[PDB]
Design a binder for this molecule. Structure first.
Ligand code: ZN
Length: 500
């Protein structure tokens, strides 16, 4: 039955019914199923394994790297009535030995365990002789070279599905990169599992991106015209831009404070309180709570879509209207691409950072609703334009390349989703390269159907289709038509570029 969940739901959490897709989620893991759960961070996401752990006999085994964070998940839980504990190598050998006893005696509802502890051959043996309700892999993205913090530990969690096939696995993440969603499925065998996407949308936050032009001038005009005495956060890239901006703001009568990794650990706690407890304070920070936050300003490009979402997301936590306002230019993209180039990072990190940036730039350049593009990155599809973003409200002039997008998508399909942008372009142009003649492509009916345009436009159309996920690359430069391709091909969706 589904309703014992509800009795525990509000006898413990205090919510009268599930939110969005969580009812579906809790039922699937409680009836012994597997699951892929993608949600913004929050105690609603924790509900998805904590509640099933209460519903099924035995202990939920929660895998997480945040061992520093850990000790207040049990503290939170041990006053609701729930029994939970921590197992990791920060512990003394007697203490480690008594959580184990407690585990073996069916005394815990939840066991939080660092990957380091879990993957030890000894630890996996205890589990075999302990009453286990499930495995929850939190922050599942870590298995991936792509999505966030890779960890060498995390891609060994292969083993849960091996040594414990019969026990349910639910993997939950807040960073749902599309290459990363795919890689989690592979490590924890959830290819065959349902994948659940709860909404990332924050409807009350209006999204704006625009061109940098005297950014300190632009900002002040924004703050006075639209958020005169309200609490806001202004993010800057460097510790020096925080300092100087913070006192530039003070100079114009705005109660601004600096907040960075740098100076004193007392002021930092001091700055938090002034923000947390007073009204109309603006904090300037690099990367690093208040229910009352009316805007988030970006005066430089964030490092990623993940970061941008978490940062803008600190706004409007009281459900009321808030603005996310960002300007970038010129030099911001150049400065970034130069650092990627002079970075001493490993090959895959250079590969990840380049698509991170491509993703972000693609969002910055949206010719249609920004929100749709943003939410798509996290695997959420918003059917209709939102009506609360600068693109929606002030539509830019667009070039329609829908017809060309269709030609391109068919071209890659009748050639088997394997040739590269340049080759496809040859076919489109009706050029009898020898690579072409070798595959017979010279008299497919699609050959030269694109002779109308030159080489430069097609490569452009192709990047655009790649960036928006109508094509998928990482075949090694071969382009595959994705499922999303039906949109342009059959369901009337349009490909629009900014007129620029
Ligand atoms: Zn919109």
């Amino acid at each position: 039955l589904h309703d014992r969940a509800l009795h525990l739901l509000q006898t413990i959490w205090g919510y009268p019914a599930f939110r969005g897709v969580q009812g579906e989620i809790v039922q699937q893991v409680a009836e012994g199923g597997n699951a892929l759960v993608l949600m913004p961070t929050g105690g609603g996401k924790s509900l998805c394994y904590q509640l099933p752990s209460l519903l099924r006999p035995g202990t939920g085994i929660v895998v997480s790297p945040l061992i520093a964070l850990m000790k207040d998940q049990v503290d939170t839980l041990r006053q609701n009535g729930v029994r939970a504990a921590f197992l990791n190598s920060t512990l003394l050998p007697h203490e480690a030995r008594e959580v184990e006893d407690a585990l073996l005696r069916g005394d815990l509802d939840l066991l939080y365990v660092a990957p380091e502890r879990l993957l030890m051959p000894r630890t996996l043996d205890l589990l075999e002789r302990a009453p286990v309700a499930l495995f929850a892999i939190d922050e599942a993205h870590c298995v991936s070279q792509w999505g966030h913090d890779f960890r060498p530990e995390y891609q060994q969690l292969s083993v849960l599905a091996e040594r414990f096939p019969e026990l349910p696995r639910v993997a939950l993440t807040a960073t749902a990169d599309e290459r990363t969603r795919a890689d989690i499925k592979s490590v924890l065998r959830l290819e065959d599992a349902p994948q659940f996407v709860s909404s990332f949308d924050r409807p009350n936050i209006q999204y704006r991106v625009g061109l940098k032009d005297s950014p300190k001038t632009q900002l002040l005009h924004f703050i006075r015209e639209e958020h005169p005495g309200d609490a806001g956060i202004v993010y800057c890239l460097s510790r020096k831009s925080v300092e100087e901006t913070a006192k530039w703001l003070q100079a114009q009568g705005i109660d601004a404070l600096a907040y960075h990794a740098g100076l004193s650990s007392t002021e930092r706690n001091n700055v938090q309180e002034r923000f947390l407890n007073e009204e109309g304070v603006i904090v300037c920070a690099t990367v690093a709570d208040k229910p009352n936050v009316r805007f988030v300003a970006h005066l430089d490009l964030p490092k990623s879509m993940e970061g941008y979402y978490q940062e803008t997301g600190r706004a409007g936590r009281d459900g009321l209207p808030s603005t996310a306002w960002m300007v970038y230019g010129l030099s911001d993209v150049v400065n970034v691409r130069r650092m990627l180039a002079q970075s001493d990072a490993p090959e895959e990190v250079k590969r990840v950072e380049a698509s991170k940036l491509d993703a972000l730039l693609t969002y910055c350049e949206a010719a249609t609703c920004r929100r749709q593009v943003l939410l798509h990155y996290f695997g959420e599809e918003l059917s209709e334009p939102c009506g609360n973003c600068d693109v929606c409200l002030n539509p830019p002039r667009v070039r329609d390349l829908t017809r060309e997008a269709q030609m391109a998508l068919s071209a890659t399909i009748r050639t088997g989703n394997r040739f590269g942008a340049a080759h496809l372009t040859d076919v489109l142009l009706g050029r009898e390269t020898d690579k072409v003649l070798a595959q017979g492509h010279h008299q497919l009916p699609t050959f030269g159907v694109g002779k109308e345009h030159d080489e430069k436009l097609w490569r452009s159309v192709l990047r655009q289709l790649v960036s928006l996920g109508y094509l998928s690359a990482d075949d090694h430069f071969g382009l595959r038509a994705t499922g999303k391709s039906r949109g342009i091909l059959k369901e009337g969706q349009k490909l629009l570029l900014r007129e620029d």
